[PDB]
Amino acid sequence: SAEKTREVLWQQYYASNPPDHAVLEVLATPVREALLARFGQHQGSVVPAIDLPELRSVLQQFDSFGKRWEAILLQVLEGILPYLSELINKELMILL
C-alpha cells in the first residue's frame, strides 16, 4: 500500500547517518503539495485558530503525530509564500 511504501522511506531516513535530506524531500513532497493546495494562494495574516487545525489535519493524512511532523514541516519549508511559512513556524513552536 501507499502506507507501506512511505514506511520504507522513513526506515531509510532514520537509519541514515548523517540524516539524508534527499529521502526526507521525497517524504515531504506530497505533504508540501497538499499544503500548497490549501494555503498557496493565501496572502496577508495567518489565522491560528482556523489554520493550525487545518495544517495538522493535512499532516495527519500522511504521518502519525510525533517527531515525523517536525521533520516534515522543516523540509516543506525548504521547498517554499510567507503565509504557509508563518503557519509552519507557529506549529513548530507548539511542537517544541
CA distance 17 to 37: 33
**What single-letter amino acid sits at 27?**
L
At residue 12, φ and ψ (nearest 5 deg) are -70, -35
H/E run at residue 23: helix 21-39
- Per the document, the length of the chain is 96
CA distance 79 to 96: 22
CA distance 88 to 74: 8
The CATH class that applies to domain 1-96 reads mainly alpha
CA distance 5 to 82: 31
Residue found under cell 495567518: 46
